[PDB]
């Protein structure tokens, strides 16, 4: 069993099989041909485990899937046009009218919109529960419960979930547990190893690393991934990942270990710094001693990650002033790029709302979120420091 | 004077782009970027509130895609466009946005297989009622409308029989009962047929086929009113499918569109010469091509398509086994699903797509044991003729 860096570079590919090419060639093709109608016939039931149309089985995409499956330690992988691609295809195939999905207390905005305004409107029952509270979770189960879905750590406050805890509970009811592992990557956390059934990824973020691609991943067990490929992707979503973008995702995956180390090192520093700031009410970073779920965090993540959330003392106004003053962080939604990013939802995403609605969603008035990039930590410090000056 | 619409080719190469707004770049740069940033936190406050113009995240809107979208809209004759990861991405994003439990969809009698799967085993398992109807029969369609009918959805010409519908007839009926008409316009492209100009509310495309023209990308387009395209963009795509089109692929789609009028003229000139030849060969029992008077809906084709297309279907004498022997003798056509490539493609559903079924359930689906489908490409006609004639001789 080769190491993670090795596998992330080499897994699933032998140059000697493809003309000696160091880097595998990109199958930017829509369709595939057949030597005979017989060899055609085989590929519409599926006996010679291989290549089928490119909206089902392109080699380039297969290489990506196998590598990601290796990295998350799962049976099988599926690549998709976007992270929503991955989550919609999974849920559309796993759920039907009357089934229930249990959801983590908070969710990526578009996931929430999919659940409450998408499948939810098609007769699927939604319940939100705190997924670190195993008793609340147990009590929430009903015969109807078929899926339990959550992120860990979860936007907005890095609130973790006890993956193995929930998974014990799901076994008692044959429920499928699905974990959005976008924030951690298989490099920092492997939820399948902790007993989840499927993981989903917005590969758009850390896995790509360079913010030039939109892509999605699903990893899990061959049977589940099979159904999602042939039902979710093929029939319900059509979220097909382009071969060019697959290749670039692979190119990005080759540095995962190296980039995530830096992202973390950079975040650790920025966070001990913020933790001492008198403009700072409160801070959420898994790697501080003050992080309420510190122990659970260290149990599931091998490093505390590249994301920080803090609340500024002066609410919306401070938030605004802080955001405007940054010259190195860019005001943008998104995360996991080489570039450092910030957002202040109160005055950005959730601006149109009001204080009382933002409290409902746990979006504090002065809540800012940092995606710490790979720039030099002294440059990142100077920027955060001056931006704090302006926030007075 | 200057209130005249530019020609189709002109709009295909230029619409929506002036080099002078991107520093003289003759070809638009490609926005291969996932995210966009904001100068002020206020500037971006408005981009989540309808006040200002710009882009937030390439899953919702992007300048490479926007141009592609605007060009397609101009070609189709519609208000707005939307570009997605595939034909199915376009179709599913649209129906997921437009339908809810208790709504009914009227469907054409036959469809593309994944569209059929999506409908029967996907959206239909979610509380949406389905009914099929001969769209060529306006009397039957009128009869089928009920106050639950929300959409009428069909392809014209349809897979795989090229059955056609009267678009303007359907729209007329739909305007009377109040349903949204969506037409899958893949086979024609906007160069041969414009359903929106005929009264349809939305067209969808597998741009993967003719629009791309070069079989290297998978991509979907939807075109219609600003108010429905936005709904679809903001609900279907953003929330329910995530069928995001890659800007690299959209740049290639745009590159392919630049020669559409030329590719199409040649697909059609080729198929016409092929069809006429096939109609006259001993091994050919039957032939379906819209440019032939023997085509059952000859009159609707002439009326609705400016040209008869690159698809031919034809039945062989000798039974499945002639088919096999034909398909396998081919040296220039390739054995393959798909259409609208530069390369000529053939398929023999009997010994291929529908090969697991026994000779019974194939005759049950209108599908002969001698049926073969041709997507005629852009090769030299004699070469194509020569290959097919050598191949008929083999299936003797
Ligand atoms: N995940 C980021 C951006 C994706 S659109 C966010 O939370 O806004
Ligand atoms: N539309 C073509 C190819 C897509 S798989 C077909 O009818 O099979």
Q: Is B112 labeled as catalytic in the residue annotation?
A: yes
3 state DSSP class of A151:
strand
- Final residue belonging to a domain, choices B225, B260, B295: B260
Q: Are residues B125 and B208 in the same domain?
A: yes
Give the residue from B260, B282, B308 where a domain finishes.
B260
Please check whether residue B1 lies inside any domain of the structure. no
CATH of the domain at A337: 3.90.1150.10
Burial A312-327 (b: 16+ CB within 10 A, else e): bebbbebbbbbbbbbe
* Peptide bond just before A156 cis, omega within 30 deg: yes
Identify whether B305 is part of a domain.
yes
User: What was the experiment behind these coordinates?
Assistant: X-ray
A212 and A271, same domain (yes or no): no
Looking at the structure, tell me whether residues B191 and B335 fall in a common domain.
no
Q: What is the CATH number of the domain that holds B149?
A: 3.40.640.10
Nearest residue of B to residue A317 by CA position? B41
Q: Say if residue B57 carries a ligand binding annotation.
A: yes
- Written as one string, the DSSP assignment of B323-382 is HHHHHHH-SSSEE-S--S-SS-EEE-GGGTTT-SS-HHHHHTTT--SSEEEEE--SS-HH
Total count of domains within chain A: 2
CA distance A175 to A147: 6
Count of Cβ atoms closer than 10 Å to residue A68 Cβ: 28
Q: A251 and A266 share a domain? A: no
Q: What is the resolution of this structure in A?
A: 2.6
Ligand nearest to the CA of A109: 1
CA end-to-end distance (rounded Å), chain B: 61
Is B146 annotated to bind a ligand? Reply is no
Do B340 and B287 share a structural domain?
yes
Straight-line distance from the first to the last Cα atom of chain A, in angstroms, rounded to the nearest whole number:
54
- From start to end of chain B, where are the E strands? 80-84, 104-107, 129-132, 149-155, 180-184, 202-206, 220-224, 284-288, 311-316, 334-335, 345-347, 371-375
How close is the Cα of B394 to the center of ligand 2, in Å? Answer: 26
CA A111 to centroid of chain Cα atoms = 11
Distance CA A325, CA A302 (A): 34
**B300 is a domain residue:** yes
Q: Closest Cα to residue B116, out of B374, B354, B389?
A: B354
Residues B151 and B178 occupy one common structural domain: yes
Beta bridge partners of A147: A101, A176
Binding residues of A for substrate: 108, 369
Same domain, B336 and B256: no
Query: Is B235 in the same domain as B344?
Result: no
Q: Is residue B323 part of a domain?
A: yes
**The tokens of B396 are what?**
């003797």
B354: domain range? Answer: 261-394
Q: CA nearest B48 in A: which residue? A: A349
The reply to whether A283 and A205 lie within a common domain is: no
Ligand with an atom nearest the CA of residue A52: 2
Distance CA B34, CA A277 (A): 33
Within a domain: residue B38? yes
SS3 at position A22: coil
| Sign of the CA dihedral with B217 first, then B234, B173, and B117 last | positive
Q: Give domain status of residue B27, yes or no.
A: yes
**Is residue B314 located within the same domain as residue B235?**
no
DSSP run (H or E) holding B73: helix B63-76
**Residue that finishes a domain, picked among B260, B281, B315:** B260
State whether A133 and A194 are in the same domain.
Answer: yes
Q: Is residue A244 within 8 Å of A28, Cβ to Cβ?
A: yes
Cα–ligand 1 centroid distance for A360 (angstroms) = 19
Q: Are B368 and B267 contained in the same domain?
A: yes
Question: Does B136 fall in a domain?
Answer: yes
């Amino acid at each position: 069993l080769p190491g993670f860096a090795t596998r992330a570079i080499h897994h699933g590919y032998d140059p000697q099989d493809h003309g000696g090419a160091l880097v595998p060639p990109v199958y930017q093709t829509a369709t595939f041909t057949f030597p005979t109608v017989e060899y055609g016939a085989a590929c519409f039931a599926g006996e010679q485990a291989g290549h089928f149309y490119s909206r089902i089985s392109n080699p380039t995409l297969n290489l990506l899937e196998a590598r990601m499956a290796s990295l998350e330690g799962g049976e099988a992988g599926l690549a998709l046009a976007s992270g929503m691609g991955a989550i919609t295809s999974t849920l559309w195939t796993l759920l039907r009218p009357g089934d229930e999905v249990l959801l983590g207390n908070t969710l990526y905005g578009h996931t929430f919109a999919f659940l409450h305004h998408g499948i939810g409107e098609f007769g699927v029952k939604l319940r939100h529960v705190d997924m670190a509270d195993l008793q609340a979770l147990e009590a929430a189960m009903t015969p109807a419960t078929r899926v339990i879905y959550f992120e860990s750590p979860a936007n907005p406050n890095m609130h973790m979930a006890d993956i193995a805890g929930v998974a014990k509970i799901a076994r008692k009811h044959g429920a499928t547990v699905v974990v959005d592992n976008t924030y951690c990557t298989p490099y920092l956390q492997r939820p399948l190893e902790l007993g989840a059934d499927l993981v989903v990824h917005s590969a758009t973020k850390y896995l790509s690393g360079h913010g030039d691609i939109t892509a999605g991943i699903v990893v899990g067990s061959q049977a589940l991934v099979d159904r999602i490929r042939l039902q979710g992707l093929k029939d319900m979503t059509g979220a097909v990942l382009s071969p060019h973008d697959a290749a670039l995702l692979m190119r990005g995956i080759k540095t995962l270990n190296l980039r995530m180390d830096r992202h973390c090192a950079n975040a650790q520093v920025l966070a001990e710094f913020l933790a001492r700031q008198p403009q700072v009410e409160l801070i959420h970073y898994p790697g501080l001693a003050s992080f309420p779920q510190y122990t659970l965090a260290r149990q599931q993540m091998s490093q505390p990650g590249g994301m920080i959330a803090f609340e500024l003392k002066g609410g919306i106004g401070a938030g605004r002033r802080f955001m405007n003053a940054l010259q190195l962080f860019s005001r943008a939604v998104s995360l996991g790029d080489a570039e450092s990013l910030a957002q202040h939802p109160a005055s950005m995403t959730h601006s149109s709302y009001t204080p009382e609605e933002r409290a409902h969603y746990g979006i504090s008035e002065g809540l800012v979120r940092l995606s710490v990039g790979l720039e030099d930590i002294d440059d990142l410090l100077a920027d955060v420091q001056q931006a704090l000056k302006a926030s007075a």
